[PDB]
From a paper:
Aspartate α-decarboxylase is a pyruvoyl-dependent decarboxylase required for the production of β-alanine in the bacterial pantothenate (vitamin B5) biosynthesis pathway. The enzyme catalyses the decarboxyl­ation of aspartate via the formation of an imine link between the α-amino group of the amino acid and an N-terminal pyruvoyl group. The pyruvoyl group is formed via the intramolecular rearrangement of a serine residue to generate a backbone ester intermediate which is cleaved to generate an N-terminal pyruvoyl group. The activated protein therefore consists of two chains, the N-terminal β-­chain and the C-terminal α-chain, which includes the N-terminal pyruvoyl group formed from Ser25.
To further investigate the role of Thr57 in activation, we determined the three-dimensional structure of the T57V mutant. The T57V mutant ADC crystallized in space group P6122 under similar conditions to those used in previous studies and was subsequently cryoprotected using sodium malonate. Three bands were observed for all site-directed mutants other than T57V. Initial analysis suggested that Thr57 is required for activation, as the T57V mutant cannot be catalytically activated in E. coli at 37°C. Ramjee et al. observed an increased rate of autocatalytic activation of purified ADC at higher temperatures. In this region, the structures of both protomers are similar to each other but in both cases are distinct from the structure observed for the WT zymogen. The hydrogen-bond interaction observed between Ser25 and the β-amide of Asn72 in the WT zymogen is lost owing to these changes in the torsional angles of the chain. The presence of bound malonate in the crystal structure leads to displacement of the unprocessed chain. This means that it is not possible to determine whether the observed conformation in the zymogen is owing to the hydrogen bond between Thr57 and the carbonyl of Gly24, but it may be that the very lack of this hydrogen bond is critical in allowing malonate to bind. A structural analysis of the zymogen reveals that substantial backbone rearrangement occurs as a result of the adventitious binding of a molecule of malonate in the region of the unformed active site; however, there is no evidence for ester formation in the protein, suggesting that Thr57 is required for the formation of the ester intermediate.
Residue numbers in the entry:
A (entry chain A), C (entry chain A): -4 to 117
B (entry chain B), D (entry chain B): 1 to 117
The structure:
Amino acid sequence: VPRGSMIRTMLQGKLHRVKVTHADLHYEGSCAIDQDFLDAAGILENEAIDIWNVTNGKRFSVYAIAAERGSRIISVNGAAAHCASVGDIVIIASFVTMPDEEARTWRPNVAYFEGDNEMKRT
Amino acid sequence: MIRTMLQGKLHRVKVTHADLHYEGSCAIDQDFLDAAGILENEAIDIWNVTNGKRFSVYAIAAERGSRIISVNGAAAHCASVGDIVIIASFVTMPDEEARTWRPNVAYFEGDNEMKRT
Amino acid sequence: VPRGSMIRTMLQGKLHRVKVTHADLHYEGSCAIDQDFLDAAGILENEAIDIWNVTNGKRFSVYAIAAERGSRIISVNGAAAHCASVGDIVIIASFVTMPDEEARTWRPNVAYFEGDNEMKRT
Amino acid sequence: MIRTMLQGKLHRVKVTHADLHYEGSCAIDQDFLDAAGILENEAIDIWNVTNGKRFSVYAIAAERGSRIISVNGAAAHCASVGDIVIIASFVTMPDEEARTWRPNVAYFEGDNEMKRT
């Protein structure tokens, strides 16, 4: 309300420059991300995510499940292993929808990475 | 805030038919649609394990037990008969529900035999 | 209601196998579709549409505005002219969202084409 | 039923910066965001007239009057400085409203000069 309000698609959070740690094309299962990283970016298990590959430029859509907390895992499995490889630097983002007013004051959850998937607030 | 969540996935089915010239839609055995919660005419993503292509389309139901995965029309440029593919659909819901949501996943081997019981 | 209902993305309608009639990369303006065809497929002016190119396999997302009724126009303009050319056979679809119950009994608006963009119900 | 509608578009801007290695986001002059109704952190599509590539990302605001169109991070693989691109965002609303919706379109020439009055 107002009913019929125009709804925006906004960046909810992203993991900026994580490094892919595992990639298995033949995997019977999902992509996975350390739960600590999900938490920092506000990303949920089984939430749609975009992955934008800094190393090779590929851009694709998938979902991930939680890897154990503290594992530092970024696993890109199944068909998505044709789009990322271990060592590649990627950006992982999720988007949510909300009405325009809320969108204009929204602050995304952004976590920045370096080194061995070490996470910084800024 | 509204989240986009995996609703369900058919993991590792084989394309059985692919007709570029079809006057009609892609089709999936209704038993596989049933297992993954995927509806006739719902938006689906198809991720091709054999060639890496990733595309979006929709499917209607094929006859139960036919094991059909048919990728027709323009989509026949992105998969061929015998390719292994992963098919998923996504739904939206508020954050509060999405935190406990569980998707429907079905796994397959061989000639489209669903790992079942 | 129930509040929080799971919302599906469903095919609202499509134009099956129309032929692209104009394509201008340098165009200051939009893609356009004869209003009669929009009407048959339930597609709106300025609605997001997917175009799946049967001739060259490209798949892309755009929007169109109404061309004059009866012109039989399918015009693919701007950057999208790198994805379709005059003569190419394409499928144009739109998707809408709705709750799961409604989705299970939804019937999309499908119009089939042949010849000089002559439209049939079946 | 909920429709996805064009909210607004920047038609024919030139990319002014493209840094693959950026610790940060794509950026657009706030005056251009203002003209097309596009928000900081909103999902946008970028359609590259010069090379045909089409991708999705988001942007934050660049300084007013800077004329900046900066395509950074992985997206720097899809556009270069001097490419002409079209940037759009989409919103959703019920069918009843979408029937009369009007998007915000701004047209440009030259060095990112918005056709204005």
